Amino acid sequence: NVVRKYAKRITEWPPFEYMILATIIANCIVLALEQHLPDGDKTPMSERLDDTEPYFIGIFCFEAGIKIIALGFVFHKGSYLRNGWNVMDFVVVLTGILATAGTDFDLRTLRAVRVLRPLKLVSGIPSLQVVLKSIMKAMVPLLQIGLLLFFAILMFAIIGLEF
């Protein structure tokens, strides 16, 4: 409740953050270590990489729980789901949890969101966040150029249909 909401704000002591960083790089290396074979074949080491997933999903869920109990959820106008980067972490962890539902259509499209886990490096290093904002600030004026390019492509595509 509220007696414990006071304590896990202290839990964000910097070694905890660097341990979350460490598990993020560990997950990135595990993802980069995979190899794909055509027709349902799989390598002898891909099984081990597939068994190492529950530790990662558990650590991410534990981190989300700490951030959800120490902070709010949506209510206090400052909380987990009211931060842009914390929403991406929530999507990643929630979808990883949902991928352990034992159905058919999940695996092909619910395993793909797992590639957004390297972006938790940006989500965990505020300097990278400000650098990313600097990058993306100069590409809002390019929206009109995007509309113009799409209009030119439409006109020339219509002409190509005609001829």
Binding site: A112, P118, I135, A138, L142, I153, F156, A157, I158, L161
Partner: protein, 286 residues
């Protein structure tokens, strides 16, 4: 896949022509299906309007945004702080030369009347005055230039007399540059030798060259090509030219914002990694 059989196919092939990738094969296909007299009026205007004109607009918008952002309050503050640092360092260098001349004349006066201390200190001052003299500059540039001539003429199937000649010339040049570093470091003092970033470059390059020599002694086959980077010391000829300030301040700005550059080449790496993992998910093994 590259046909105009539909609005979506037409959009896809037009977009592929926009990127100037395989836009002629699509043109050379309409030169066979129909005549070649009128097809260029569809593609040359398309290329001009989609790839040349749009690149022009993107460059203009980006440069305008850069000009607008650069002259804000915090960016201007950072630039003025950098300018202040440069001015302070220049004045401090001048005053340090003042004090060094004072040291020289004083030590000469006490020697005009522990003995090996005085001997070694006057030897140090003589070296430090030598390694800054204009003739040392020219002799070092001559050695560097004669080094690049010995690496620019390595070609396939070169005469065997040339291979041994350059093999021994590499050792001769490594010895000469190690001697030059030793004299310079003893004269200026190690704390001051690394005050100039280009001396850090030279030290790192000769260390890498020694590492390459050792590694080739162990395994003759491989060659890291680090001994060639000594050609970058030819770049000091700009010192005796009216264009030292521009290039030096470019390097100063780069080294100052070398943290905002590494954290830009990293976000690019993160996005390339994300797209690599996405491509492995989608097309992996298929």
């Amino acid at each position: 896949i590259t046909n105009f059989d539909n609005i979506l196919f037409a959009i896809l092939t037009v977009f592929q022509c926009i990127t100037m990738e395989g836009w002629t094969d699509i043109l050379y296909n309409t030169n066979d299906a129909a005549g070649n007299t009128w097809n260029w009026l569809y593609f040359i205007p398309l290329i001009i309007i989609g790839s040349f004109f749009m690149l022009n607009l993107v460059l203009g918008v980006l440069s305008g945004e850069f000009a607008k952002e650069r002259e804000r309050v915090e960016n201007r503050r950072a630039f003025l702080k950098l300018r202040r640092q440069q001015q302070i360092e220049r004045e401090l260098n001048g005053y340090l030369e003042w004090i060094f001349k004072a040291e020289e004349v004083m030590l000469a006066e006490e020697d005009r009347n522990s003995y090996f201390r005085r001997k070694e200190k006057m030897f140090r001052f003589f070296i430090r005055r030598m390694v800054k003299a204009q003739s040392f500059y020219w002799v070092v540039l001559c050695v560097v230039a004669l080094n690049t001539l010995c690496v620019a003429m390595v070609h396939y199937n070169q005469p065997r007399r040339l291979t041994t000649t350059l093999y021994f010339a590499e050792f001769v040049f490594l010895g000469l540059f190690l001697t030059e570093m030793s004299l310079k470091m003893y004269g200026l003092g190690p704390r001051s030798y690394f005050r100039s970033s280009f001396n850090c470059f030279d030290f790192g390059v000769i260390v890498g060259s020694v590492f390459e020599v050792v590694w080739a002694a162990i395994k003759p086959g491989s060659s890291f090509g680090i001994s060639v980077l000594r050609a970058l010391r030819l770049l000091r000829i700009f010192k005796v030219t009216k264009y030292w300030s521009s290039l030096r301040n470019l390097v100063v700005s780069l080294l100052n914002s070398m943290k905002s550059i590494i954290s830009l080449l990293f976000l690019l790496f993160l996005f390339i990694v994300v797209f690599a993992l996405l491509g492995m998910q989608l097309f992996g093994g298929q």
